[PDB]
Protein backbone atom coordinates (compact mmCIF):
# COMPACT_ATOMS: atom_id res chain seq x y z
CA UNK A 1 0.00 0.00 0.00
CA UNK A 2 2.87 2.37 0.78
CA UNK A 3 4.52 1.65 -2.57
CA UNK A 4 1.42 2.64 -4.55
CA UNK A 5 0.69 5.93 -2.81
CA UNK A 6 0.40 9.00 -5.02
CA UNK A 7 2.91 11.76 -4.33
CA UNK A 8 1.65 14.77 -6.32
CA UNK A 9 -1.83 15.00 -4.82
CA UNK A 10 -4.84 15.90 -6.93
CA UNK A 11 -2.59 18.12 -9.08
CA UNK A 12 -1.28 15.13 -11.00
CA UNK A 13 -1.35 13.81 -14.53
CA UNK A 14 -4.31 11.76 -15.78
CA UNK A 15 -3.74 9.39 -18.68
CA UNK A 16 -5.64 11.79 -20.94
CA UNK A 17 -2.71 14.21 -21.06
CA UNK A 18 0.60 13.67 -22.79
CA UNK A 19 1.31 12.98 -26.43
CA UNK A 20 -1.58 13.40 -28.85
CA UNK A 21 -3.29 10.40 -30.41
CA UNK A 22 -4.13 9.27 -33.90
CA UNK A 23 -7.84 8.46 -34.34
CA UNK A 24 -8.62 4.95 -33.15
CA UNK A 25 -10.98 4.05 -36.05
CA UNK A 26 -8.75 3.24 -39.03
CA UNK A 27 -10.54 3.38 -42.37
CA UNK A 28 -9.57 0.92 -45.08
CA UNK A 29 -11.16 -0.65 -48.15
CA UNK A 30 -10.80 -4.46 -48.00
CA UNK A 31 -9.86 -6.56 -50.99
CA UNK A 32 -13.10 -8.26 -51.92
CA UNK A 33 -16.65 -7.70 -50.81
CA UNK A 34 -17.61 -4.70 -48.69
CA UNK A 35 -21.03 -3.68 -47.45
CA UNK A 36 -22.48 -0.43 -48.84
CA UNK A 37 -22.42 1.48 -45.55
CA UNK A 38 -18.75 0.85 -44.76
CA UNK A 39 -17.95 1.83 -48.33
CA UNK A 40 -19.77 5.14 -47.92
CA UNK A 41 -17.95 5.58 -44.61
CA UNK A 42 -14.53 5.02 -46.17
CA UNK A 43 -15.30 7.37 -49.07
CA UNK A 44 -16.52 10.07 -46.68
CA UNK A 45 -13.45 9.61 -44.48
CA UNK A 46 -11.15 9.98 -47.49
CA UNK A 47 -12.86 13.20 -48.54
CA UNK A 48 -12.67 14.42 -44.96
CA UNK A 49 -8.95 13.71 -44.81
CA UNK A 50 -7.98 15.37 -48.08
CA UNK A 51 -10.44 18.29 -48.05
CA UNK A 52 -10.52 18.84 -44.25
CA UNK A 53 -14.33 18.52 -44.06
CA UNK A 54 -17.33 16.78 -45.56
CA UNK A 55 -17.70 17.36 -49.28
CA UNK A 56 -21.27 17.68 -50.61
CA UNK A 57 -22.58 15.21 -53.14
CA UNK A 58 -22.49 17.74 -55.98
CA UNK A 59 -18.73 18.14 -55.48
CA UNK A 60 -17.81 14.49 -54.94
CA UNK A 61 -16.04 12.75 -57.83
CA UNK A 62 -18.26 9.89 -58.96
CA UNK A 63 -15.88 8.33 -61.49
CA UNK A 64 -13.13 7.56 -58.92
CA UNK A 65 -15.79 6.21 -56.56
CA UNK A 66 -17.13 3.77 -59.14
CA UNK A 67 -13.55 2.78 -60.01
CA UNK A 68 -12.83 2.13 -56.32
CA UNK A 69 -15.91 0.07 -55.51
CA UNK A 70 -15.33 -1.93 -58.68
CA UNK A 71 -11.84 -2.76 -57.38
CA UNK A 72 -10.14 -1.21 -60.42
CA UNK A 73 -8.12 1.17 -58.24
CA UNK A 74 -6.95 1.06 -54.64
CA UNK A 75 -7.36 3.65 -51.89
CA UNK A 76 -3.94 5.08 -52.76
CA UNK A 77 -5.12 5.76 -56.32
CA UNK A 78 -8.42 7.14 -55.00
CA UNK A 79 -6.47 9.58 -52.82
CA UNK A 80 -4.33 10.44 -55.84
CA UNK A 81 -7.44 11.21 -57.89
CA UNK A 82 -8.81 13.36 -55.08
CA UNK A 83 -5.52 15.24 -54.82
CA UNK A 84 -5.30 15.81 -58.58
CA UNK A 85 -8.83 17.19 -58.87
CA UNK A 86 -9.67 20.82 -59.53
CA UNK A 87 -11.34 21.05 -56.11
CA UNK A 88 -8.02 20.39 -54.37
CA UNK A 89 -6.17 22.87 -56.58
CA UNK A 90 -8.90 25.42 -55.88
CA UNK A 91 -8.87 25.02 -52.10
CA UNK A 92 -5.28 24.18 -51.17
CA UNK A 93 -3.02 25.43 -53.95
CA UNK A 94 -4.55 28.56 -55.45
CA UNK A 95 -4.95 30.63 -52.23
CA UNK A 96 -1.51 29.76 -50.81
CA UNK A 97 2.18 30.25 -51.54
CA UNK A 98 4.13 27.20 -52.59
CA UNK A 99 5.84 26.91 -49.20
CA UNK A 100 2.39 26.72 -47.60
CA UNK A 101 1.31 24.29 -50.33
CA UNK A 102 4.05 21.88 -49.23
CA UNK A 103 2.78 22.03 -45.64
CA UNK A 104 -0.80 21.38 -46.76
CA UNK A 105 0.34 18.46 -48.93
CA UNK A 106 2.12 16.79 -46.03
CA UNK A 107 -0.88 17.43 -43.78
CA UNK A 108 -3.42 15.97 -46.19
CA UNK A 109 -1.51 12.94 -47.43
CA UNK A 110 0.91 12.10 -44.62
CA UNK A 111 -1.09 13.38 -41.63
CA UNK A 112 2.02 15.29 -40.76
CA UNK A 113 3.91 18.52 -40.85
CA UNK A 114 6.99 18.88 -43.05
CA UNK A 115 9.88 17.12 -41.34
CA UNK A 116 12.87 19.23 -42.33
CA UNK A 117 14.11 22.03 -44.54
CA UNK A 118 15.22 19.39 -47.05
CA UNK A 119 11.60 18.36 -47.58
CA UNK A 120 10.77 22.03 -48.15
CA UNK A 121 13.62 22.33 -50.67
CA UNK A 122 12.70 19.16 -52.55
CA UNK A 123 9.01 19.96 -52.83
CA UNK A 124 9.66 23.62 -53.63
CA UNK A 125 11.91 22.66 -56.53
CA UNK A 126 9.26 20.20 -57.71
CA UNK A 127 6.54 22.87 -57.49
CA UNK A 128 8.60 25.49 -59.32
CA UNK A 129 9.48 23.05 -62.09
CA UNK A 130 6.38 20.93 -62.58
CA UNK A 131 3.42 21.99 -60.43
CA UNK A 132 0.86 20.15 -58.34
CA UNK A 133 0.65 16.81 -60.12
CA UNK A 134 4.31 15.86 -59.80
CA UNK A 135 4.50 17.09 -56.20
CA UNK A 136 1.39 15.08 -55.33
CA UNK A 137 2.77 11.92 -56.92
CA UNK A 138 6.03 12.53 -55.06
CA UNK A 139 4.11 12.64 -51.77
CA UNK A 140 2.03 9.59 -52.67
CA UNK A 141 4.78 7.45 -54.22
CA UNK A 142 7.02 8.05 -51.22
CA UNK A 143 8.16 5.24 -48.95
CA UNK A 144 6.62 6.92 -45.91
CA UNK A 145 3.17 6.70 -47.47
CA UNK A 146 3.55 3.03 -48.35
CA UNK A 147 4.83 2.20 -44.87
CA UNK A 148 2.03 4.06 -43.09
CA UNK A 149 -1.01 3.60 -45.32
CA UNK A 150 -0.01 1.15 -48.05
CA UNK A 151 -2.70 0.66 -50.67
CA UNK A 152 -5.89 0.33 -48.62
CA UNK A 153 -5.78 2.64 -45.58
CA UNK A 154 -7.12 6.18 -45.74
CA UNK A 155 -4.46 8.61 -44.45
CA UNK A 156 -5.08 9.80 -40.92
CA UNK A 157 -3.66 12.44 -38.62
CA UNK A 158 -0.28 11.57 -37.11
CA UNK A 159 1.90 13.16 -34.43
CA UNK A 160 5.27 11.53 -35.12
CA UNK A 161 7.82 11.31 -32.33
CA UNK A 162 10.88 11.78 -34.57
CA UNK A 163 12.56 13.87 -35.89
CA UNK A 164 12.95 16.83 -33.54
CA UNK A 165 10.25 19.48 -33.72
CA UNK A 166 8.00 17.21 -35.78
CA UNK A 167 5.55 16.39 -33.00
CA UNK A 168 4.86 20.03 -32.11
CA UNK A 169 4.66 21.05 -35.75
CA UNK A 170 2.27 18.17 -36.41
CA UNK A 171 0.08 19.17 -33.47
CA UNK A 172 -0.17 22.72 -34.78
CA UNK A 173 -0.66 21.57 -38.39
CA UNK A 174 -3.36 19.03 -37.57
CA UNK A 175 -5.20 21.34 -35.18
CA UNK A 176 -5.34 24.03 -37.85
CA UNK A 177 -8.65 24.60 -39.58
CA UNK A 178 -9.08 26.24 -42.97
CA UNK A 179 -8.29 29.92 -42.49
CA UNK A 180 -8.75 31.25 -46.03
CA UNK A 181 -11.95 32.46 -47.66
CA UNK A 182 -13.49 29.68 -49.71
CA UNK A 183 -13.88 31.93 -52.74
CA UNK A 184 -12.29 34.98 -54.30
CA UNK A 185 -15.55 36.61 -55.37
CA UNK A 186 -17.87 38.82 -53.33
CA UNK A 187 -15.85 39.27 -50.12
CA UNK A 188 -17.54 39.90 -46.81
CA UNK A 189 -16.82 42.89 -44.61
CA UNK A 190 -16.94 43.76 -40.93
CA UNK A 191 -19.74 46.25 -40.41
CA UNK A 192 -23.21 46.79 -39.03
CA UNK A 193 -26.62 48.04 -40.07
CA UNK A 194 -28.53 49.75 -37.31
CA UNK A 195 -32.33 49.18 -37.09
Amino acid sequence: IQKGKALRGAEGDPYTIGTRRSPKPIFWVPQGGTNPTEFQNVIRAAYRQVFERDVPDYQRLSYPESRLKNGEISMREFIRQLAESDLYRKQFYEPYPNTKVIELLTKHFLGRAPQDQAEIQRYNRILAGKGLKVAIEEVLNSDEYTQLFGEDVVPFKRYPTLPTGTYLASVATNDEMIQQSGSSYSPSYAGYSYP
Binding site: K24, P25, I26, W28, P36, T37, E38, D57
Partner: protein, 160 residues
Protein backbone atom coordinates in the same frame (compact mmCIF):
# COMPACT_ATOMS: atom_id res chain seq x y z
CA UNK B 1 -26.48 -5.73 -37.88
CA UNK B 2 -25.10 -5.31 -34.36
CA UNK B 3 -22.86 -8.36 -34.78
CA UNK B 4 -21.51 -7.16 -38.13
CA UNK B 5 -20.70 -3.71 -36.76
CA UNK B 6 -18.93 -5.19 -33.74
CA UNK B 7 -16.89 -7.61 -35.86
CA UNK B 8 -15.99 -4.96 -38.44
CA UNK B 9 -14.87 -2.57 -35.71
CA UNK B 10 -12.81 -5.28 -34.00
CA UNK B 11 -11.17 -6.22 -37.31
CA UNK B 12 -10.37 -2.54 -37.91
CA UNK B 13 -7.81 -2.69 -35.09
CA UNK B 14 -6.96 -6.35 -35.87
CA UNK B 15 -8.00 -7.54 -32.42
CA UNK B 16 -10.51 -9.85 -30.82
CA UNK B 17 -13.77 -8.47 -29.48
CA UNK B 18 -13.41 -6.71 -26.15
CA UNK B 19 -15.62 -7.61 -23.17
CA UNK B 20 -17.67 -4.51 -23.94
CA UNK B 21 -18.27 -5.64 -27.52
CA UNK B 22 -19.22 -9.13 -26.35
CA UNK B 23 -21.59 -7.55 -23.83
CA UNK B 24 -23.08 -5.53 -26.69
CA UNK B 25 -23.65 -8.74 -28.66
CA UNK B 26 -25.06 -10.51 -25.60
CA UNK B 27 -27.47 -7.66 -24.93
CA UNK B 28 -28.60 -7.70 -28.54
CA UNK B 29 -29.22 -11.46 -28.63
CA UNK B 30 -30.98 -11.40 -25.25
CA UNK B 31 -33.46 -8.90 -26.73
CA UNK B 32 -33.97 -10.93 -29.90
CA UNK B 33 -37.34 -12.47 -29.06
CA UNK B 34 -38.82 -9.07 -28.17
CA UNK B 35 -37.82 -7.42 -31.44
CA UNK B 36 -38.97 -10.52 -33.31
CA UNK B 37 -42.39 -10.11 -31.71
CA UNK B 38 -42.40 -6.42 -32.68
CA UNK B 39 -41.44 -7.23 -36.27
CA UNK B 40 -44.13 -9.90 -36.49
CA UNK B 41 -46.71 -7.47 -35.13
CA UNK B 42 -45.71 -4.93 -37.78
CA UNK B 43 -45.71 -7.49 -40.59
CA UNK B 44 -49.14 -8.91 -39.72
CA UNK B 45 -50.72 -5.45 -39.89
CA UNK B 46 -48.85 -4.16 -42.94
CA UNK B 47 -51.98 -3.68 -45.07
CA UNK B 48 -53.71 -1.66 -42.35
CA UNK B 49 -50.59 0.40 -41.69
CA UNK B 50 -50.03 1.18 -45.36
CA UNK B 51 -53.67 2.10 -45.98
CA UNK B 52 -53.94 4.39 -42.95
CA UNK B 53 -50.57 6.02 -43.67
CA UNK B 54 -51.68 6.68 -47.24
CA UNK B 55 -54.91 8.21 -45.98
CA UNK B 56 -53.04 10.50 -43.59
CA UNK B 57 -50.45 11.45 -46.22
CA UNK B 58 -53.10 12.32 -48.81
CA UNK B 59 -55.13 14.26 -46.25
CA UNK B 60 -52.03 16.29 -45.39
CA UNK B 61 -51.05 16.77 -49.06
CA UNK B 62 -53.95 16.77 -51.54
CA UNK B 63 -51.67 18.33 -54.17
CA UNK B 64 -49.91 14.99 -54.67
CA UNK B 65 -53.09 13.24 -55.84
CA UNK B 66 -54.74 16.32 -57.34
CA UNK B 67 -54.42 16.81 -61.12
CA UNK B 68 -50.92 17.91 -61.99
CA UNK B 69 -49.56 16.06 -58.97
CA UNK B 70 -46.90 13.43 -58.49
CA UNK B 71 -49.21 10.61 -57.36
CA UNK B 72 -52.26 11.65 -59.39
CA UNK B 73 -54.07 8.67 -60.85
CA UNK B 74 -54.73 5.19 -59.54
CA UNK B 75 -51.46 3.67 -60.78
CA UNK B 76 -49.26 6.45 -59.39
CA UNK B 77 -51.08 6.33 -56.06
CA UNK B 78 -50.56 2.56 -56.02
CA UNK B 79 -46.85 3.16 -56.70
CA UNK B 80 -46.78 5.60 -53.78
CA UNK B 81 -48.42 3.07 -51.48
CA UNK B 82 -46.00 0.41 -52.69
CA UNK B 83 -43.08 2.66 -51.75
CA UNK B 84 -44.60 2.97 -48.28
CA UNK B 85 -44.79 -0.83 -48.18
CA UNK B 86 -41.10 -1.02 -49.14
CA UNK B 87 -40.14 1.22 -46.26
CA UNK B 88 -42.33 -0.66 -43.79
CA UNK B 89 -40.54 -3.86 -44.80
CA UNK B 90 -37.18 -2.13 -44.38
CA UNK B 91 -38.20 -0.96 -40.90
CA UNK B 92 -39.06 -4.54 -39.96
CA UNK B 93 -35.68 -5.71 -41.26
CA UNK B 94 -33.88 -3.01 -39.30
CA UNK B 95 -35.83 -3.94 -36.18
CA UNK B 96 -34.72 -7.56 -36.38
CA UNK B 97 -31.15 -6.57 -37.28
CA UNK B 98 -30.88 -4.17 -34.37
CA UNK B 99 -29.75 -1.14 -36.37
CA UNK B 100 -30.60 1.04 -39.36
CA UNK B 101 -28.08 -0.72 -41.61
CA UNK B 102 -30.65 -2.64 -43.75
CA UNK B 103 -32.75 0.52 -44.01
CA UNK B 104 -29.76 2.53 -45.19
CA UNK B 105 -28.40 -0.12 -47.53
CA UNK B 106 -31.66 -0.90 -49.32
CA UNK B 107 -33.50 2.40 -49.20
CA UNK B 108 -31.30 5.36 -48.24
CA UNK B 109 -28.09 5.19 -50.33
CA UNK B 110 -28.98 6.94 -53.56
CA UNK B 111 -32.55 7.73 -52.52
CA UNK B 112 -32.19 11.45 -53.25
CA UNK B 113 -30.97 11.07 -56.83
CA UNK B 114 -33.46 8.25 -57.39
CA UNK B 115 -36.47 10.32 -56.35
CA UNK B 116 -35.01 13.26 -58.27
CA UNK B 117 -34.96 11.11 -61.41
CA UNK B 118 -38.59 10.24 -60.67
CA UNK B 119 -39.67 13.84 -59.91
CA UNK B 120 -40.88 12.71 -56.47
CA UNK B 121 -40.79 15.49 -53.84
CA UNK B 122 -38.71 14.68 -50.78
CA UNK B 123 -40.91 16.51 -48.22
CA UNK B 124 -43.77 14.31 -49.39
CA UNK B 125 -41.61 11.30 -48.54
CA UNK B 126 -40.77 12.76 -45.13
CA UNK B 127 -44.43 13.33 -44.33
CA UNK B 128 -45.32 9.83 -45.54
CA UNK B 129 -42.65 8.42 -43.24
CA UNK B 130 -44.10 10.42 -40.35
CA UNK B 131 -47.59 9.12 -41.13
CA UNK B 132 -46.35 5.53 -41.26
CA UNK B 133 -44.51 6.14 -37.98
CA UNK B 134 -47.76 7.26 -36.36
CA UNK B 135 -49.82 4.34 -37.67
CA UNK B 136 -47.15 1.74 -36.82
CA UNK B 137 -46.47 3.05 -33.31
CA UNK B 138 -50.22 2.98 -32.75
CA UNK B 139 -50.15 -0.81 -33.08
CA UNK B 140 -47.38 -1.17 -30.52
CA UNK B 141 -47.10 -0.74 -26.77
CA UNK B 142 -45.04 2.08 -25.31
CA UNK B 143 -41.83 0.06 -25.04
CA UNK B 144 -42.08 -1.35 -28.57
CA UNK B 145 -43.33 1.91 -30.08
CA UNK B 146 -40.40 3.75 -28.50
CA UNK B 147 -37.82 1.67 -30.36
CA UNK B 148 -39.77 1.50 -33.64
CA UNK B 149 -40.07 5.27 -33.64
CA UNK B 150 -36.28 5.49 -33.67
CA UNK B 151 -36.08 3.56 -36.95
CA UNK B 152 -38.88 5.61 -38.48
CA UNK B 153 -37.08 8.76 -37.32
CA UNK B 154 -33.83 7.65 -38.91
CA UNK B 155 -35.68 7.05 -42.17
CA UNK B 156 -37.37 10.46 -42.06
CA UNK B 157 -34.11 12.23 -41.26
CA UNK B 158 -32.21 10.41 -44.00
CA UNK B 159 -34.84 11.44 -46.54
CA UNK B 160 -34.47 14.99 -45.19
Amino acid sequence: SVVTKAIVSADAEARYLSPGELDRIRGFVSSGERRLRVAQTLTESRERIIKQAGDQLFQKRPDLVSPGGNAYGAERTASCLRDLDYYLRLVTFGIVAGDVTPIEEIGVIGVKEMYRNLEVPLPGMVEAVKAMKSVATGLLSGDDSAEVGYYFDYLAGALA
